[PDB]
């Protein structure tokens, strides 16, 4: 052990008492009882580091003596080293941020609460539901799986963080009403802030006087990529497109892990890393700002040489004090510090590649379905398949051994069989794809060929509404850490499940053209942060928009909303054009309000009264109303309409005369006519409300049914 590992593991295990008190294993307050749990665990297996680590959950007389009994020399530490570590972690607990049965209340909707479960993307969708007490039996089962895993883990934050995340994700950090903070998130942020305070040269006297709290000894480091949809879409195939997306994820991790390495920080110091956007809490030493300047410049110089002006990385950092991690006198200082950091990033994005003074004077990615992750090695190394700005990336396959100081491991919190010396880095990626008759990812052509009726490629781009404002309303680092993680995990964790046809009772009846296949004709280009780009059989993509919107409504408390752009294209349309159209349509969905979907391209009056988008509920109602009367399912019209298909086409012609001029009363004169009663009359509540006639809306259903039946 050295002071850095001790302060990092101490921050992590400070509040491990909470789960053991709540399970009624011992007697006493969470403080005393957490000390007992680790002391007891230390004696079992025989790892004395846990008895050292047990000191964190507890005049300074008794303390100095208890530390002295645990011989500090044994671990290569001083007595005065450990006192700092404890005092540092004590403040770190306060900065990061009562019945013993209260569950975790949802950051999305504090009125609703999570059933107790372990974080598992293959089990069931987290749904904030009715407030239920958690049984003192459930905590006991948690604590015993927890004890069994700490017993086998290497006592390195990269081996501790994962087991704390599995089991303490759906646990209230404090058992108050409307507590939003996951215990895991409070633990990782305390460790983050604690290790930062250490590196800031802060010491016990400083913590005692507040000359750490009331002084700018921290850095908020934000990194946003710029030129992404230029870097990913706007190529020259679906294979290559997934390779670019995967490449941008590795490039990002290479910068983040480089920063953590050089500042002497842990993965816990990563507040978030989603959609090419990362945030890190760090020390404010002259040494660290110099290390960041070197990193910022070497990363940009590499991006410029490798991809020209296409992809830029804007990196900024702001000096920040303990005060600013928390609310002070009704002012959210943390949001106020984030806002000032946001501003520096916007300025840096307007000084693109200004870190090069020389400014004003595709086979490796093709080769890029049996791998478990990548090793972060030297650039000059055998097996390196792709290179990032700082390091080479060797693919780690099931049959083979991993290679490098860091191993990036895909879609697990279990180190697997990697060497003890190698840093475990779990990364989640939404990588669902329809498997070909060959084991390879299907093509635009094969996806389009699998559609009901018309052969078109389905393309949907989705994006959460007003996320920025939601994150701005997070009081503390640990709160922000829960919001960002829960948000990212919906897209990275559960979209695969939603595609597989899970969460049927949660989702319910959605607009649909066919029975949901067991292996859907869907391929994810990207899903992370608060956004997705997905392609597939047009009719399956149409349905997946409604599935994903409802799963997200349930996953939030019905308190956050999506907007979606949908596109149905000839399979030969180049990617760049498909991306730009679904982007224009997503943007439109947001201009016209949010919580709406661009279902299909539509004619309309340009009188500023007629939106192209639909409100999700308005389209879902329209579909329930009209679809069953005209559509039998699985590519088939109703029998009554087999000879009367033209009636559907005549309505779309009637609707065009409403679009020619929605004031002229000819579409009335024109209108079994008991098939569409809501469209015959001249709706008057609409005329007064200054809103469109029901006839305006019907195309959204009819055009989709006609594509299905052709």
């Amino acid at each position: 052990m050295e002071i850095d590992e001790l302060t990092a593991l101490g921050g992590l295990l400070h509040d491990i008492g909470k789960p053991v008190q709540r399970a009624g294993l011992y007697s006493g307050d969470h403080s005393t009882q957490g000390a007992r749990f680790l002391r007891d665990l230390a004696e079992n297996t025989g790892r004395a580091e846990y008895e050292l680590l047990s000191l964190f959950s507890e005049n300074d007389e008794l303390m100095i003596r208890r530390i002295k009994e645990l011989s500090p020399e044994r671990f290569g530490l001083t007595m005065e080293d450990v006192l700092n570590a404890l005092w540092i972690v004590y403040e770190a607990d306060n900065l990061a941020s009562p019945q013993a049965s209260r569950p975790l209340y949802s950051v999305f909707n504090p009125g609703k609460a999570y059933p107790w479960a372990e974080l598992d993307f293959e089990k069931e969708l987290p749904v904030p539901g009715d407030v239920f007490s958690i049984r003192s039996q459930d905590y006991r089962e948690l604590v015993k799986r927890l004890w069994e895993e700490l017993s086998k883990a290497k006592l390195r934050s990269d081996r501790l963080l994962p087991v704390l995340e599995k089991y303490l994700t759906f646990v209230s950090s404090v058992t108050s009403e409307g507590n939003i903070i996951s215990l895991y998130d409070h633990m990782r942020m305390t460790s983050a802030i604690a290790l930062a305070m250490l590196r800031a040269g802060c010491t016990a006297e400083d913590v005692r006087s507040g000359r750490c709290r009331k002084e700018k000894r921290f850095l908020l480091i934000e990194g946003d990529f710029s030129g992404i949809q230029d870097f990913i879409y706007r190529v020259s195939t679906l294979k290559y497109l997934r390779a670019r997306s995967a490449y941008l994820e590795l490039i990002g991790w290479d910068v983040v892990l480089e920063i953590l390495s050089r500042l002497g920080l842990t993965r816990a110091n990563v507040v978030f890393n989603a959609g090419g956007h990362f945030m890190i809490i760090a020390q404010n030493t002259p040494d660290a700002v110099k290390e960041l300047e070197e990193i910022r410049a070497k990363a940009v110089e590499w991006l410029y040489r490798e991809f020209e002006s296409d992809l830029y990385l804007a990196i900024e950092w702001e000096p920040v004090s303990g005060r600013e991690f928390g609310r002070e006198g009704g002012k959210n200082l943390f949001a106020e510090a984030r806002k000032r950091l946001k501003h520096k990033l916007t300025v840096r994005k307007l000084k693109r590649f200004g870190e090069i003074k020389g400014l004003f004077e595709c086979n490796r990615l093709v080769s890029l379905p049996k791998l478990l992750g990548f090793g972060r090695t030297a650039k000059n190394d055998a097996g390196v398949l792709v290179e990032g700005p700082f390091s080479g990336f060797v693919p780690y396959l099931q049959g083979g051994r991993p290679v490098g100081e860091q191993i990036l491991v895909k879609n697990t919190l279990n180190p697997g069989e990697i060497p003890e010396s190698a840093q475990f880095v779990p990364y989640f990626v939404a990588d669902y794809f329809k498997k070909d008759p060959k084991g390879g990812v299907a093509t635009f052509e094969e996806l389009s060929m699998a559609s009901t009726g018309t052969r078109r490629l389905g393309v949907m781009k989705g994006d959460v509404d007003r996320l920025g404002e939601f994150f701005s309303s997070m009081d503390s680092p640990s709160k922000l850490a829960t919001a960002s993680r829960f948000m990212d995990y919906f897209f990275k964790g559960y979209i695969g499940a939603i595609i597989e046809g899970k969460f049927g009772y949660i989702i319910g009846d959605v607009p649909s053209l066919r029975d949901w296949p067991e292996e859907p004709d869907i391929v994810v280009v990207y899903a992370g942060g608060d956004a997705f780009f997905i392609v597939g059989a047009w009719d399956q993509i149409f349905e997946l928009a409604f599935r994903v919107r409802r799963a997200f409504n349930a996953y939030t408390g019905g308190k956050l909303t999506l907007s979606v752009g949908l596109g149905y294209f000839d399979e030969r349309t180049p990617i760049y054009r498909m991306a730009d159209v679904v982007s224009e349509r997503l943007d439109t969905a947001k201009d016209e309000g949010r919580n709406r979907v661009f279902v299909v391209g539509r004619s309309r009056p340009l009188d500023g009264k007629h939106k192209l988008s639909y409100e999700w509920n308005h389209y879902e109602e329209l579909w329930r109303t009209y679809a069953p009367r005209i559509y039998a399912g699985n590519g088939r019209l109703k029998g009554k309409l087999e000879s009367k298909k033209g009636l559907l086409w005549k309505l779309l012609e009637i609707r065009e005369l409403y679009v020619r001029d929605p004031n002229d009363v000819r579409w009335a004169y024109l209108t079994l006519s008991d098939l569409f009663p809501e469209l015959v009359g001249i709706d008057t509540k609409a005329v007064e409300r200054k809103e469109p006639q029901p006839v305006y809306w019907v195309d959204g259903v009819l055009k989709i049914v006609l594509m299905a039946v052709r």
């Binding site: 002006s309 307007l350 000084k351 693109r352 030969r572």
Partner: protein, 253 residues
């Protein structure tokens, strides 16, 4: 200051809205076809000597549009839900009308054009099979494109006017006086895409291979520069990258 506005009245659609480099190119080519390279050299001399042309901007009837100065992107804060929503649409706006441009130069509140007088229609065609697109620019009624000239009238009458008439033979040409009120300032916006001599204040890169600063970029006393090069053609070729500066008030940031 006051400028000559060269109005291109379009006789059908346009491939793109031309920027200062392409406009100077076309004009240098036209002057070579009329007066020989002796006149091209006098043109370059006039421009190196202080004469400038802007990139082309849309107009609609009596409405001249100019590029949004990048100065106001980081200033926009100068309701909660309303402000983030407008700020995203101001941030996306490429053009302001003259009145709202002159206000943006002074960091005073300003509004955006609701509808822009051109639509990008990219038309698809099948090639034997695949689909390709040709960007076309469709002009609303009595709408089109204009650029500004600053410098002596004799250089305008002697080179720019005759060249622009030649280039018209897709468009006809007419010119009017235009006044832009701009604050006195250490800092200026470029109304032309430029090859900078100094690192600029705020900018968007423009890849063409040359690295240009886009229209709307902010510089401090940067005249830009012209480049001559040899491409194996009969004549040496000049690349226009001079700044067309108007004073611009910057926020302290």
């Amino acid at each position: 200051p006051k400028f000559i506005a060269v109005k291109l009245i379009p006789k059908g659609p346009f491939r793109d809205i031309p920027r200062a480099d392409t406009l100077f190119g076309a004009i240098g080519n036209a002057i070579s076809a009329i007066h020989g390279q002796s006149a091209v050299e006098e043109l370059v001399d006039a421009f190196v000597g202080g004469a400038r042309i802007s990139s082309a901007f849309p107009y609609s009837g009596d409405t001249y549009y100019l590029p949004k100065p990048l100065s106001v992107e980081p200033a926009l804060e100068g309701d909660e839900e309303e402000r983030y929503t407008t700020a995203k649409r101001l941030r996306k706006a490429k053009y302001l009308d003259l009145k709202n441009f002159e206000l943006a130069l002074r960091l005073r509140p300003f509004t955006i054009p609701e509808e822009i007088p051109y639509a990008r229609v990219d038309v698809p065609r099948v090639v034997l099979s695949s689909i390709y697109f040709w960007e076309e620019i469709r002009f609303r009624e009595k709408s089109g494109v204009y650029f500004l000239y600053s410098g002596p009238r004799e250089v305008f009458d002697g080179y720019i006017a005759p060249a622009m008439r030649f280039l018209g033979d897709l468009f006809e040409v007419e010119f009017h006086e235009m006044k832009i009120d701009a604050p006195g300032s250490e800092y200026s916006v470029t109304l032309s895409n430029a090859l900078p001599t100094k690192t600029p204040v705020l900018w968007r890169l423009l890849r063409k291979r040359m690295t240009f600063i886009a229209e709307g970029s902010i510089v401090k006393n940067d005249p830009g520069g012209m480049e001559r090069l040899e491409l194996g053609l009969s004549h040496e070729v000049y690349v226009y990258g001079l700044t067309f500066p108007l004073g611009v008030e910057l926020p302290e940031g």
